[PDB]
Ligand binder design. Sequence first.
Ligand SMILES: Nc1ncnc2c1ncn2[C@@H]1O[C@H](CSCC[C@H](N)C(=O)O)[C@@H](O)[C@H]1O
Ligand SMILES: Nc1ncnc2c1ncn2[C@@H]1O[C@H](CSCC[C@H](N)C(=O)O)[C@@H](O)[C@H]1O
Lengths: 357, 357
Amino acid sequence: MTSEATLARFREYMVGPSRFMTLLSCFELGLVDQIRDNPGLTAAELGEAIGAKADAVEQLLLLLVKEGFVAHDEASGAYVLDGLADVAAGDLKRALAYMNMIKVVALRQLFHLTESAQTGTLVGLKELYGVTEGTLYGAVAEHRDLRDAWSNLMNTVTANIDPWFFGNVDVPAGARVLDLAGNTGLGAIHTVAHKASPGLQVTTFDLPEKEQEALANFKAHGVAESCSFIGGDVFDGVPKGFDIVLIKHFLDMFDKDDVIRILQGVNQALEVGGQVNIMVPVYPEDITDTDNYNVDFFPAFFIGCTMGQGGPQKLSAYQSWLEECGFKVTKAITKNAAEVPPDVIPVQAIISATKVV
Amino acid sequence: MTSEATLARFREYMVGPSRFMTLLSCFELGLVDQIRDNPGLTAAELGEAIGAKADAVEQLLLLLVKEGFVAHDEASGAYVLDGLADVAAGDLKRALAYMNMIKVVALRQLFHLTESAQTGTLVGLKELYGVTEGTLYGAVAEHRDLRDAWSNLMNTVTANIDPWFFGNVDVPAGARVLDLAGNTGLGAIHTVAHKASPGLQVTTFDLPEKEQEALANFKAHGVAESCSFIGGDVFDGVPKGFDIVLIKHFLDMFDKDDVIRILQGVNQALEVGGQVNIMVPVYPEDITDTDNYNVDFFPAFFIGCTMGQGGPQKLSAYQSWLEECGFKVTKAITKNAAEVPPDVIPVQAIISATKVV
Ligand SMILES: Nc1ncnc2c1ncn2[C@@H]1O[C@H](CSCC[C@H](N)C(=O)O)[C@@H](O)[C@H]1O
Ligand SMILES: Nc1ncnc2c1ncn2[C@@H]1O[C@H](CSCC[C@H](N)C(=O)O)[C@@H](O)[C@H]1O
């Protein structure tokens, strides 16, 4: 790879921040809605509609014309949607929810990635919110803006991927299922929806503060009889007396040492023949693969923004760590990136394993 | 532009901030220096040297391996420079200085681009530095981290592009030259250095609070006899008695109506045959062009980070505005593309015009 190709790629990297917010601000300002709802307005007409100078509107829309999202008639000054014309409202809501989460959880916090990587602490959250200890997950109880941006997304990501998950995981009649780090219970609710059987019991395990929201989630989905909540810290111990443990979007938050503690805990909580089903973003075996954006996002996201440690691993590393912790792998499935909508960053693997210890 | 293609481009926009800081942090941490100075070190050894966990070093370098900037040996876990190996010391220092400026001036402030666009003010600058009104240019004097990141870098890029400017502008013997928005007089000093001739007089025109810093710069560079300062607002009129007005990196700070007012003010200050020489970033006449990164960067940078208004224009726009303000264009040039390093964002134009009123 050339020195001049390297310097060219640096420039692509340098315009990342300005590109990201130019596009998001065009949605936040209401410009895209105005252009969709009223085809053929000028910068002056759009400016009056959204409460901004026409000259500001003109400049910010230039990048959307360059990318072919929006078209501009040179003669009239008129704007219409181009690329964005045929994007379904559902697809755009998904993408904007992820972009909003990055803006709130990552954009400003990333300034302090270096200091975060040096201390193994979240300097971003320290500087912005005055949080001195722990993770984003510990702080969202106290910080409404952080909780809504992160929670709404995680729940959209989970609603979209879990049909695939439950289609590839075995939950037999009358199973006792633990959803480890199950947040406000959507994972447990999905278990009941897809695996409804007589005697089926599902429990959400997460931070004690999630309890009231979890119980209300169960009530709202009509599954309060078959779903329950245990509050705690995974590092204090995994609840005992389950047949099957689900671990969805959790192991990638942690370095090996803590992943090993989680899986050793999960082992102690299971009988021989008890099962664990893991869904986690994985790096590909060949890191140069362009169909997988996990490495372009998560290292900086976990180290600088949410944890102060962690990041995904190759499916082979997770398979190895399960084997070190007294489990035998029965399933390993990587999601086809071309079968996921092209706006979605995470590429997940499913790993199923049986305790043999 | 298809729906599918639009959503894929959204994914490319979303990973921009994480990509940007992952690369910069790898330099800030000292990981690139350690890998260059000590080839074949592991993540553990690199981690001991910089004061970060091996697990953190591993995760942050993965993206550099994906891009081929750095190579990783499966067997030994050894890191060497790849793409970055043949990149000149001087090229990297320029790239890193510009990236550092974007980190300090743009990264956090862009969070508030929407609010900055609605109010015509720098909400970022207010949120972080308590600056109630005005521009990045005003706020530099009282704030050290902005001054060092932005002010120092401007001087360096000034000195690299000034030879091309003065090499393309006609300043005959005995010329009376006004440097419009000449700041603290560097532009006037550089004019004297490049065009030294019998009877050459060069005046810096800027806000009064620069008069003292300018007079001292002239003394120190030994050009007090050739260079003076005149304090004023350009919108209250341009000083008379000048043959040539230089306008470098000023016009892009304003919207059309204000640009017209400056060019009319310059026209009123000149006799028929008086000359103006503008240097300004330009948008390409075909805005879809990928060699020109001005639209990916400047709309958000001006509106969100530096001015709360303004931005570049097409060279054709600036030429039409000069002709509207009683000027005849004699020269309109861009820099030889091949002589511009591929890391450099701003595409510069020079336009020369003669008052014909
Ligand atoms: N020490 C800890 N013990 C238990 N849960 C924890 C934890 N640290 C973080 N968590 C939880 O881990 C979850 C990670 S996000 C994943 C949520 C859910 N499994 C899903 O896939 O949608 C959050 O709900 C967070 O509160
Ligand atoms: N209304 C106004 N009248 C005169 N100078 C102004 C002005 N508004 C801003 N300025 C000046 O515009 C300058 C822009 S700094 C960059 C321009 C400089 N000629 C260079 O090439 O480096 C600042 O020095 C600022 O003080």
